[PDB]
Amino acid sequence: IKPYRDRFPSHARLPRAGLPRAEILAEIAAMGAAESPAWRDGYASGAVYHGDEHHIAFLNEVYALQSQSNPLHPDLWPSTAKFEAEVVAMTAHMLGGDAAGGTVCGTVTSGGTESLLLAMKTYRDWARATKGITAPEAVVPVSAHAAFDKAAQYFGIKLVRTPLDADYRADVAAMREAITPNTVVVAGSAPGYPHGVVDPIPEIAALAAEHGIGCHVDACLGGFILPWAERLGYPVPPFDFRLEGVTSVSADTHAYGYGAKGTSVILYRRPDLLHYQYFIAADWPGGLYFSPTFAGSRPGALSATAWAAMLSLGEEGYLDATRRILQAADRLKAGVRAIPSLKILGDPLWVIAVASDELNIYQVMEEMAGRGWRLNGLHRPPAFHVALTLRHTEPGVVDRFLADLQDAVAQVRAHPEKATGMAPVYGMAAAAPPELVRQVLTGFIDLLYEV
Amino acid sequence: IKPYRDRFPSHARLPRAGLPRAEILAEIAAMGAAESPAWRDGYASGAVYHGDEHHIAFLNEVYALQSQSNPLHPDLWPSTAKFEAEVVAMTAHMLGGDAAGGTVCGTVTSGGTESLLLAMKTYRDWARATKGITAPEAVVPVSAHAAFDKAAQYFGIKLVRTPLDADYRADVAAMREAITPNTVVVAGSAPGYPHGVVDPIPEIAALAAEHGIGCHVDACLGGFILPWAERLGYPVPPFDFRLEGVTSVSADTHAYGYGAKGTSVILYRRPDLLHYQYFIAADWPGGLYFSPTFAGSRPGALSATAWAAMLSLGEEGYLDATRRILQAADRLKAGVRAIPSLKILGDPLWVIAVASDELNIYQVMEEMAGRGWRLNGLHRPPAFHVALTLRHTEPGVVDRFLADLQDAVAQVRAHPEKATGMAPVYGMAAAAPPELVRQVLTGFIDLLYEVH
Numbered sequence A: 001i002k003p004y005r006d007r008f009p010s011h012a013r014l015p016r017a018g019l020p021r022a023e024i025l026a027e028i029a030a031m032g033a034a035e036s037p038a039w040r041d042g043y044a045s046g047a048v049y050h051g052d053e054h055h056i057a058f059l060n061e062v063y064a065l066q067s068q069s070n071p072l073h074p075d076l077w078p079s080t081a082k083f084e085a086e087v088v089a090m091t092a093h094m095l096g097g098d099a100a101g102g103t104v105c106g107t108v109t110s111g112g113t114e115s116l117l118l119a120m121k122t123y124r125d126w127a128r129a130t131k132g133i134t135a136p137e138a139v140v141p142v143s144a145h146a147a148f149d150k151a152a153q154y155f156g157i158k159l160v161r162t163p164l165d166a167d168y169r170a171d172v173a174a175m176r177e178a179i180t181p182n183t184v185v186v187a188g189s190a191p192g193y194p195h196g197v198v199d200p201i202p203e204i205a206a207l208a209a210e211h212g213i214g215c216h217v218d219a220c221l222g223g224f225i226l227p228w229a230e231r232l233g234y235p236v237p238p239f240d241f242r243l244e245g246v247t248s249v250s251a252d253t254h255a256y257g258y259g260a261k262g263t264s265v266i267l268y269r270r271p272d273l274l275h276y277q278y279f280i281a282a283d284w285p286g287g288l289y290f291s292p293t294f295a296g297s298r299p300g301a302l303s304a305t306a307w308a309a310m311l312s313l314g315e316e317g318y319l320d321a322t323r324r325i326l327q328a329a330d331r332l333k334a335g336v337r338a339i340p341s342l343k344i345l346g347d348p349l350w351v352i353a354v355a356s357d358e359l360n361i362y363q364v365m366e367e368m369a370g371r372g373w374r375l376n377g378l379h380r381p382p383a384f385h386v387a388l389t390l391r392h393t394e395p396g397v398v399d400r401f402l403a404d405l406q407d408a409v410a411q412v413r414a415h416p417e418k419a420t421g422m423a424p425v426y427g428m429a430a431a432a433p434p435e436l437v438r439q440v441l442t443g444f445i446d447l448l449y450e451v
Numbered sequence B: 001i002k003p004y005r006d007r008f009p010s011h012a013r014l015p016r017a018g019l020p021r022a023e024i025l026a027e028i029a030a031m032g033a034a035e036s037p038a039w040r041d042g043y044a045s046g047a048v049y050h051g052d053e054h055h056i057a058f059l060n061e062v063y064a065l066q067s068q069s070n071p072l073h074p075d076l077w078p079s080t081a082k083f084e085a086e087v088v089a090m091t092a093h094m095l096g097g098d099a100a101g102g103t104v105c106g107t108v109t110s111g112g113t114e115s116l117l118l119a120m121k122t123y124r125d126w127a128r129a130t131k132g133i134t135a136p137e138a139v140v141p142v143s144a145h146a147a148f149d150k151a152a153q154y155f156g157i158k159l160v161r162t163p164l165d166a167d168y169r170a171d172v173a174a175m176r177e178a179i180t181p182n183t184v185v186v187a188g189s190a191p192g193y194p195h196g197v198v199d200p201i202p203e204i205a206a207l208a209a210e211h212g213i214g215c216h217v218d219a220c221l222g223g224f225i226l227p228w229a230e231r232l233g234y235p236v237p238p239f240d241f242r243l244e245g246v247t248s249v250s251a252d253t254h255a256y257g258y259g260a261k262g263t264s265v266i267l268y269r270r271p272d273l274l275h276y277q278y279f280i281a282a283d284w285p286g287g288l289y290f291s292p293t294f295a296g297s298r299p300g301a302l303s304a305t306a307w308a309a310m311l312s313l314g315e316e317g318y319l320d321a322t323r324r325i326l327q328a329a330d331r332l333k334a335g336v337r338a339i340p341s342l343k344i345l346g347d348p349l350w351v352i353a354v355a356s357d358e359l360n361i362y363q364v365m366e367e368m369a370g371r372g373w374r375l376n377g378l379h380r381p382p383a384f385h386v387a388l389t390l391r392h393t394e395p396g397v398v399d400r401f402l403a404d405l406q407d408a409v410a411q412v413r414a415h416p417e418k419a420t421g422m423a424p425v426y427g428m429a430a431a432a433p434p435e436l437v438r439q440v441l442t443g444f445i446d447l448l449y450e451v452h
């Protein structure tokens, strides 16, 4: 659904003469006031991770002072190259980079997906050069992020997805079973996006060191949450570089790092690994050209906002934020188990996947959507999840959620036949065959791009 | 060389307690005042494309109002999904999208490189599904951007680079020669980055339609320059979708589109092509997940800055900008041919590659660097180039350049033995073997990432 089709002029052609800056800003600001109550008041799962208007006004100043930065030119903006070096270093330390000998290194990327993609490409390129593996395989849980499939398709890696156990954590045995001599990497999520549970990293990491291959830890969600939850006295095993089997880790500075959107860190245990990531061309008439990541020209300013957010918070700000989130979490989970028909999937710390055996969970979800809740629809198995952020730690938000949740279950128990709005969509999507979904969604992405 | 290693505290660990916002900003603003004179006063080739402090203050407001946008969620920020749809549409029209039947479609990407990569992956995936080609080849000029090699390595495409002619434009014949039944795409640059010259697109496009394969036009540099140069009455053949053989085109809204860094457009002629780009997963316990491009979470705000910059300029602002640039160009080229020892490579419109047969061009370049000029070092053949922007259209900038260029040649003619600063580096790099460069540069990228 396209909200501003009518309220605002549509442009499928450049205006013959330029429109005034004062007006363009006003058009955009208006859309700002329309869309920002949804995430600000706490109705959104994930999406906005900090939300505080002063922390945002702060990062916008950081962007403004670095707007022109392009780290393709480290000699014009050595300031940005500094930021990137320090975000990578501070993040390395945070994830047990010292307990590895201090050989831990990385680069700043554009997001979790790039981190994962880069990593897969690295392990693929390394395996071919050293172990001579020319038809590579990777082994991850079925809960590992969909970005892994993306890497499989792009780089020509055969991806093998293993099943989970009763707690929705990875099945470490089935992983051993699927390893072949062509397997170049195994991965574990900390936590996985679907259910918020942390795969058995120590076990997977060990399994990896055993067969002399890589182990990647997808800590894109947990990187900036888990280390602080551990010091707050929660049940979190070592997930990072403390474990010796773990060869790489990815973490999102734009997620729970509270940077602005468009930054992430990929970390490798040794430099001889990192080096397979760099792209270099020496034979090009355009001169010497190299890039650490996928991109050539990058938004230097976003690397600044990641750096500035990490310094403005420090170990205190993260410890504080993490507590306020995990508090709201434990409190929401209690309110959910308290409700009869619902169950929680596995044992999440702050990303809660709620399902039902008796009711149609998708209509429950739709009933929440009726009150303004923008939640995530899962399937295999059917459920919806809410990933908690600082936006849900504000006064009365977890309460409103549980209050609206009760009324929503009561309504669906009265009419188990009810399936309104999006409920029928999420439900068909569950049952439909891959190649049919692949086609309808393709039409949906085309609808997004219409003028 | 790391400038702030001493003046500012280095952080290899999160500060136990958070540092004040007032202070962090001051640290960054200081670095801003140190680095911004270089590109602002016009010493930089490319890098900053507009530079005007009001146009920048404007786009920063655009970013500020959209900072939170992440177009992975089109239902939370339908505003951004709108911007993206319209940047893609306005850009399509600009590059002859109507003359194609109105089936021209695209997506907004993160930069030229992603556009190119996405395209290569599309043609690879299409060729396998329709033409059953399981060991794909691509054929581009040796001047085509290095991003093409990157796609070759990533996606497993065999890349074949053809030679150029006397004008440094593509050799259309050698391209035909290298086409096999496994060739899935050919490309032409408009202009190529090295020399600023426009490959023979009409001819290449035709060559492509002939063999029933794709033709991609790398207009990342020229997309927002060439269409306006054509209406200003310059010698530019049709390079875009007017030609029927051309199946895709890439253009950088963050370059000569004067958006903020981190946006670009990839355009396809028909939707059945675009569709091979989309990534979709239906079997994932995380639910339905799709993405048009490489990224999942994106900076929505950068899509806004591209949109806002295009609207704030319109066909007038581009026509004006393009004139002021091409004027400065023609004026700089005359000043260069005027100088005895130097020659210009091919016939560039605004990206000038200057070489020398008698002198060591790298020391010429170093002599310019002495006066503050941050230029691009080319090789194969040895030269340096300057890509002109609005920053070089300001008063007296092309003049200072020619003035410093004369003094620089005079100095190198007096001491042909001289090789100071970077000159010896660019020169070794020219002669060294690929695998040696590959190793030294790897050490250089590691040096960038060190903290003292």
Ligand SMILES: Cc1ncc(COP(=O)(O)O)c(/C=N/CCOP(=O)(O)O)c1O
Residues within 6 Å of the ligand: A045, A046, A047, A048, A110, A111, A112, A113, A114, A145, A147, A189, A191, A192, A193, A218, A220, A221, A252, A255, A264, B070, B072, B295, B296, B297
């Ligand atoms: C475990 C895991 N792995 C990879 C990713 C992808 O990272 P991305 O490219 O979206 O920055 C996610 C995020 N997944 C959700 C990104 O959208 P959001 O609601 O704003 O956080 C992830 O959770």
Ligand SMILES: Cc1ncc(COP(=O)(O)O)c(C)c1O
Residues within 6 Å of the ligand: A295, A296, A297, B111, B112, B113, B114, B145, B147, B191, B192, B193, B218, B220, B221, B252
């Ligand atoms: C002519 C040309 N093509 C492609 C690219 C790649 O774009 P980017 O560096 O912005 O990713 C550039 C920079 C370029 O100048």
